[PDB]
Amino acid sequence: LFWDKEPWFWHDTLTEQLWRIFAGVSRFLQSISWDPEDFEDAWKRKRLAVPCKLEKMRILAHGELVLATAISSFTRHVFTCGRRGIKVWSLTGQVAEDRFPESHLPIQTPGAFLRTCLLSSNSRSLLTGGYNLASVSVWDLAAPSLHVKEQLPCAGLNCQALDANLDANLAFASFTSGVVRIWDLRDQSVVRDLKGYPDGVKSIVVKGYNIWTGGPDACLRCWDQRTIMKPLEYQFKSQIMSLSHSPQEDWVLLGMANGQQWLQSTSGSQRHMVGQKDSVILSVKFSPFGQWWASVGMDDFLGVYSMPAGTKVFEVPEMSPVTCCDVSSNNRLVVTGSGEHASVYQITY
């Protein structure tokens, strides 16, 4: 796309020639493939193989600064978030850059904004929240027409992080007053409140009964839902910007805002640095199978790292700082957002 001199398709040149005739006056980009049988990459000489190649295959013009993203592979759609609304894209057509969303979900309220978004794992709901907004809203994606099905109340609170656990039908959210709320989606009633830390918690991650939160105070805490015990703190030297969890093995990934990445174990207090950069890390994302992770920072770079020791397989540059990334459940697509655009890369190995 932007990397190449000019992106062309196979039928586009024929259309151009016919247009010239009518008016009287590798080399071709490919589309993204879905079927596993079409993928057809030779064995190295489902799968835990570390990726080895990338290629940009679309650009999505949002029209305003992109704060968050999400990608679904069961359905082909992509979700982009901004301060004024959410826009839903479709990956089925073939075009270099698209300007026409599949849908647009605006939010109108004087002095109301959006910060966060989150797509359930089964691709059947979508959470949304922001500042000065009456409540956290969940959209129904499986119904024939988009509409809000539930409202999760929060008065005079500014949420900045969202997370959801579907097995136990729970939803979590972190507010700027250092308060974490837990909702039960069946009734939409608050369950439990976690408070006591004024700086707030910028990132929260939930697996099992443990909630992991980290903020500028340079501490990482591990709350347990079954009791009212004080959290277990692990002091670090810099301020954490993001978190992620390993799905298979016990390991928590985190970025330190000084260009350093660490791994932390739940069972014991072991650490070891796994990567270092000259920039600020704004988001770290784990692969669904857990053998690699993606990192995006402030110095215009998207990188992929290897789980066993933290070696970086490759990275791609960009023109503007990136602020969010997401990896599909097929382990084949990755989406990142910089400036007023969102890009989609395909993973091949």
Binding site: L65, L67, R83, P110, G111, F113, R115, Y131, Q160, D199, P216, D217, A218, K237, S238, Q239, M241, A257, N258, S279, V280, L282, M298, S320, P321
Partner: protein
């Protein structure tokens, strides 16, 4: 002052004694070097000095004493000011490490110091440390450049106490403001005041600043000076001010060459706005039609702004009665038509 060993000995003993009650202190151009070093050593652990400013011709041994003063666990000087001091990269390095160690001061003033890019990077690395509480910070005539601006944008994203920030006489016009926007568009920035002066701001920077303003941003004050933003810049600025959402408090425009055709849109915006509280004008050719239109719209409108300043090329009796009309129509407006202690500089 050129002092001597005995005078300096007695003076430093007097300063260090428990009977002293100095709250502000200034040492500039003290000679010889040993006397200055001894004087700065007298402040080590002082229980009453909360300000300190420094200046000199030679500085080869200023930094060891200053860094000892800062590394002390009992020093409580709340404000530190270094003026025109010459230094080298290692001196900046150990000063930055000392400021890492220190836990007292909240305002730092570095003006005319011959910083380069490297020292700026070291100071920024100090500012990103999660345990520093520097609230105000001035970098004037420090000879900075856009790359330092990108690093500073990272600082702005990360830092969690820095509210006021001054960047005057720095050629960071277009790319610098672009990077600062990248750092300030972040929905959780804390900066409240930014100062731009002789920074080569142009229409592009005005457009970026407007895009910042239209959203709900943090900064309450913005300063512009020696910035020619006449037609396009003022189009952007006025279409920014018109909206109901802006929360900007004070706006300074000086030496910006606002033409009358821009003044019509300016007056429309002033009539529309309801949240601005202060405005300044000067050296701008508003004379014949611009001043008259401005004064008429001011009489007609009832905006929130209290203070307003301007300069008139030549006035008449009709203009005097127009001023009287402004006063009578709205009583709360104070208008004048007549520099270090300037209001913003007073705040920073």
């Amino acid at each position: 002052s050129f002092l001597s060993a005995s005078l300096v000995r007695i003076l430093c003993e007097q300063i260090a004694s428990d009977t002293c009650h100095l709250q502000r202190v200034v040492f500039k151009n003290i000679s010889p070097a040993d006397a200055h070093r001894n004087l700065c050593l007298a402040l080590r652990g002082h229980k009453t000095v909360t300000y300190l400013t420094l200046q000199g011709n030679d500085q080869d041994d200023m930094f060891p004493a200053l860094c000892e003063v800062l590394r002390h666990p009992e020093c409580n000087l709340r404000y530190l000011g270094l003026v025109s001091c010459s230094a080298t990269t290692q001196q900046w390095a150990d000063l930055s490490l000392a400021l890492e160690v220190n836990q007292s001061l909240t305002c730092v003033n570095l003006s005319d110091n011959e910083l380069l890019d490297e020292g700026a990077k070291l100071l920024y690395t100090t500012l990103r440390h999660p345990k520093c509480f520097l609230q105000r910070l001035s970098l004037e005539n420090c000879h900075l450049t856009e790359a330092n601006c990108k690093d500073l944008a990272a600082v702005l994203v990360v830092s969690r106490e820095l509210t006021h920030l001054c960047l005057a006489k720095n050629p960071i016009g277009n790319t610098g403001v672009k990077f600062l926007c990248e750092g300030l568009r972040y929905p959780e920035c804390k900066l409240q005041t930014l100062v731009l002066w002789n920074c080569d701001i142009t229409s592009d920077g005005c457009c970026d600043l407007t895009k910042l303003l239209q959203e709900k941003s943090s900064l309450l004050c913005l300063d512009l000076g020696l910035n020619h933003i006449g037609v396009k810049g003022m189009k952007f600025l006025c279409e920014a001010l018109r909206k109901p959402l802006c929360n900007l408090r004070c706006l300074w425009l000086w030496g910006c060459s606002i033409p009358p055709f821009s003044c019509e849109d300016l007056c429309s915006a002033l009539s529309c706005n309801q949240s601005l509280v202060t405005l300044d004008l000067g050296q701008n050719p508003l004379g014949s039609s611009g001043v008259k239109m401005l004064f008429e719209t001011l009489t007609c409108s009832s905006g929130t702004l209290r203070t307003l300043r301007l300069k008139i090329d030549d006035f008449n009796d009709e203009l005097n009665k127009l001023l009287e009309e402004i006063e009578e129509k709205n009583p709360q407006l104070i208008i004048d038509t007549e520099e270090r202690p300037s209001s913003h500089d007073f705040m920073i």
